[PDB]
Amino acid sequence: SPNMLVYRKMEDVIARMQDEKNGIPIRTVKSFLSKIPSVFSGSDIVQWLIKNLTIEDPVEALHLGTLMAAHGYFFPISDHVLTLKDDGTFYRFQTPYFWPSNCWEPENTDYAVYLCKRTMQNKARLELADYEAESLARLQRAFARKWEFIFMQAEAQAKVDKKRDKIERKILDSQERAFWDVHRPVPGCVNTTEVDIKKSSPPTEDELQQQIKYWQIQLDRHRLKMSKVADSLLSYTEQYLEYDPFLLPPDPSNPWLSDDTTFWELEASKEPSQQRVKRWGFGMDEALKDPVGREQFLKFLESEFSSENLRFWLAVEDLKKRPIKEVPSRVQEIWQEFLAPGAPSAINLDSKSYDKTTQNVKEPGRYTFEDAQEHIYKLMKSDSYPRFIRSSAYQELLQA
Template sequence: MGQSLTIIGSERSARRKKQKADELGDTPTVSLTAASVTDLDNVTQHQIVYKKMEQLMDRMQDENIGLRVRTVNKFRAKVPSVFTGTDLIIWMMNNLDVDDQVEALYLANLLSSHGYLFPIDDHFLNVKNDGSYYRFQTPYYWPSNIFDPENTDYAVYLCKRTMQNKKRLELADYEAENLAKLQKVLSRKWEFVFLQAEAQSKVDKKRDRMERKVLDSQERAFWDVHRPMPGTIITTEIDYRKLKRYKDVTTLPNGDINNLLPIPPPIKIINKPTVESLKKDITAMRLKLDRRNIKLSKIADTYITYFEQYAEYDPFFTPPEISNPWLLDNIEVWDCEKHSSMFCYRKEVTVRRIKRWAFSLKELLADPAGKEHFTKFLEKEFSCENLKFWEAVQNLKKLPQREVPEAAQEIWTEYLSGDSLNIDSQSRELSRKNMSAPDRWAFDIAAVHVYHLMKSDSYQRYIRSEMYKEYLNTSKKKTSMKGIRSIVSFSGKRDICPS
């Protein structure tokens, strides 16, 4: 709405200026004609506003009749190329056909909101009729010359600001939040963003101090237009629905550009595909199939490592130690001791099972033989209470409801009432509160704490211990001896001849 008001107000002022010029013999000013627009096909609702504003900015920056720009001293520091808000309003009153200060202030705020001039000490692009300082934007950053910037450019700018140890360049709260969000979104190419920001920062340091101040403020104002602070309007947004309805530009008899007129949508002519076009499509599709579009992330690498580690224990890839009795006539699995674990406990433990104990504490405790061997190790180190307490808590969850209070009281009396179990005071106090109405999960927090202690301390010492290494080497020797005996017995049977 602000842009349409600007168009109407500017055209009204232009016509009044033209009438006065005809009376006084002066040249007309601030009027957008069809000749001033080089490419009418690309004219949009924004470009019409920008052209009129830029003609006004050219007059403001004229050396003879323009606004006086000067360098002032502020708190023992020089502030280059500035003018005050009062000077701007007075210039508009004297050089433009505006009725009062309110209209001049409205026009100045429109220029500031579009980024043609900006306050040097504020992110909010607003003009006040006082002694606050403002600065003209360089034509390079004018909206008509800049396409919509990408998030990567904004990330480079914010990252560069963090590298410069200047109080005036510190990030605002909303900018710091935007930087954190961009760092998550652009995590894959953040190294590139950082290198770009570092290179730009080095180039800025080589510039003159006064020139660097001006350029820093102009770049900040550019991003205040395209990435404004919360609560402000983005003036560079395009109404694409209106742009679809209005595509043509017509001229009035006096040469002014008329409002955009609607035209019917173009009729699309669909041609029949030829053999050559189909061959090109097939070639392009084959190239897409050969190209690898998925980037392997850390999660994918973790999954690959996991499956490579467990490939030896996957029955689809490696035959299991005990064959399936439903597929083969092998009753070995029924002869094993009855146990709920997937690995039945046997006196002879294979090397594959012992190697699996080193994967994690969970794998070690899931194997009855591994749990028994780990218990012997803890007994040697006088720290078996942790494992016994954790097993008691797991067994508590399997008991019938009527037996839970009595079993919970026994666990509390044996492990937690005294100092036999090494847990933190917070877990002990929570367990004490849960004992007022004991249930299956009364000691879950303490059990988790004990499990992490075993995982980070006892289990690591067990894997590095000589006890585990000797057990593994002994199993390897037994396996090799079995192979030798089977070969010897097989060869001996072949040498026996019937008498």
Template sequence: MASSNCTSTTSCSTSFAEEKHPHPNMLIYRKMEKLINQMLHSEDGIKIKTVKSFLSKIVSVFSGQDLIVWLIAHIDVFDEIDANHLLHLFASHGYIFQVDDHVITMKGGDTSFYRFQTPYFWPSNCWEPENMDYAVYLCKRTMQNKAHLELEDFEAENLAKLQKMLSRKWEFVFMQAEAQYKVDKKRDRIERQILDSQERAFWDLHRPVPGCVNTTEVDIRKLSRSGRSKQSTCNTLVIQMEDNESQLNNSNNLKTPNIREVRFYQKPGRRRYTQIKDYLKIEISELQTRLSKNVLKTSKLAESYLQYYGHRVSFDAFIVQLGSATDPFQGQPNPWISDTVDFWQHDKITGDISTRRLKLWEESFEELLIDPVGRETLQKFLDKEYSGENLRFWMEVQKLRKCSCRMVPVLVTEIYNEFIDSNAQSPVNIDCKVMEIIDENLKNNPNRWSFDEAADHIFCLMKNDSYQRFLRSDLYRDLLNISGKKYSFSTLISRKASRKTPSKTTTNQQSLDNPQFPLNTLNTCKGLRGSSGSRSGSFVGIEREKKTKCQPNSFDSSTLTMTRGNVNSSRGIRRDSSSCSSSSVAAQQRSNNN
């Protein structure tokens, strides 16, 4: 019984080891190769011919127009543009190549000649050529004294780089190239010509001209989806199993164990384990976690999705056109359809928040936090409620998660000193369990995730308590009332402008009502205040001088200096106003002397 179990285990392990991971583009390759095999059919395929040139012959070729005609006749392709695109895909993946020019593009309607690639070089064989193979090919090209086989400029540069890179193995590379060259010389001339063109087309695909797209590169996301690692690495698992038919050792009277090696492939994107047992334990725990999760029925999921999207249909611009009669918010028109950008500039120009934006805040707490204006409005409300430190702490933790590595210790220290420490300036409301977790995280290794538990706790508090009170607050209701009133766009702009600029008529009226404020110096001293909050300076002193009829020598140099000092120390004064005041004082002195 035990032997049968061991045998079954061995067979399963062997089959697992022999399993090959498919290429992520294998489905595309199979479809292309099916069409290529139809083209190569002796009766219904493309007629391959020999073209006579001036002094030579080009064998086993066909024209691009022949491909177009065959595709239209045998495939549901009614447009020549689609046929050209399909042929371009064949050429870019290396199934067809041009004889005269070494490019991986194709124009089906031209008069150039093309040739099929041999199945040995098809991409479905998962070719991953190394630099040594490329060096052997370039060396072999240099040994052939033919004009059409001379190295291009970029190929000569690549050969020099490879010679420097493989300096220790260069003698072996040269020997391989020389051996292949001797084998090729023994072939027929026409056969050698076809093989040379096919080999060159293979390297034009895998080592393209600088500036061309390398179609052999595979996206890492496709590799992950196909379950194939970027580099096909595998670990070897040694399995020892006792075989009943094994012979006994005469010296020690022990059974010789049957040792077999099983290749074990790890999934891409996962941490590499040196011990396969550790990897298997992690995978088993993940599978057990999946089994323990509650699985909902598809009908329940579909019902919840329909309810969610049906509730948010009014915010979908594809279903409800903005600014139309069906728009429940009666906002600005869609800027991508209309010629105006009022939808984008409404909040910034008018200073008000649109109804659509306010109603979106009611949908969820996450929508409120995503919006910068929503966070600012919520912060104002929380400051009034004396709980603004909660939102500030949550924002600082989000900033910590996205900061650079060198700023992590600095931000961790700042957050702890401001919100967590016993002597913090703005302590947040967290319980003892969360505090213990934070202390443990900071003690082991402070990182960008040290405050995640506290941030989640504060987020739940704000969502369950502060967010509900915010929606019922007077601040939010006032914003809704203001946005609900219908004003024209120009009226909203003028209202915002009136908030920023103070009216000039009130200042002029105050100057006319005050008899002690001279009209001829209104533009000079307008808006000046002294240290006591009242108008002060040389002008008031001059008027007082007129009423009391002071002596001409009452304004000496010290008084003038003090006057200038008072004017310069007043808020918002400029140097030209002080110079104007001193000139008016001098003029008044002359009039008194006269």
């Protein structure tokens, strides 16, 4: 049931169309030439949808309507391209037997029977369509030996249908051309019956202890108040409004709006702009994202003679960006240079952090110093990075 969810929501609308108190009235029309029974105008639906569904945009109402028509629910009375047009064209519903939600998939031995029926009717004109006749020639070529039985069934259906009424013989014969038109569409129209290939395919006490450990996990997890969570989202969003190209245009102009390629060149330049420098101080993560930020931050620390921590920081991800073939040798190089005793770039770790990496160095891996990664990350975010903001070099670049 791939499409059954949307088929069960177009049918709910159809039932609302058909209601007598507040639905679309059905009328019989005659204009000085003939009598057309039980039809409704095309402009009836489009004005209906805007009211009940509150579709303010008139194109949206006409787009929703033409998808219902294209799927086989109401059809043009005298056309082979199912659509909805906002004029006086006459449309008519579809019988619930032929609805697409009934799991229909007809064969080619049942199309020919319908196609041979049309030639028998009105045998002085051969009323058909250009593509229908081409198919009729093709089907007879293939179904050669059994063609007699396809033609034999066509005779029986023709004579049986002859003994009927006249009003009923026209309605019940248009709603068998709005079924083969949906299922065998005119060339150049999308086939709505296609589907995606992804979607075409003991004791009772042990259960309790699994549930008990299941509940405690949720209790263990920490949660915040919706008042605080909402503040974080709005504060973050309002902090970047001036940075969104969709809601505050760039300087000089959008490359996709005015063909001004200079915007990418300015951003990729080696000299950060005034807007760039302001984004630097929003957070330490923002500064490290910019490759220019990494160099400037490191340049301050080496002048301060405290860059040994940054050199350890950048080294870990470089190991993670390295293919597995070189990790056993890369882990030892970082081991000796930074956190081994007597290292030229010795750094200080917590006892618990040092214990885990001491027992894990024996088995090299990409995630060996993750705990040291977090420990160094936290201390920069509290002390080192705020110092860089207070540093005179930061404000001098801010104003220019």
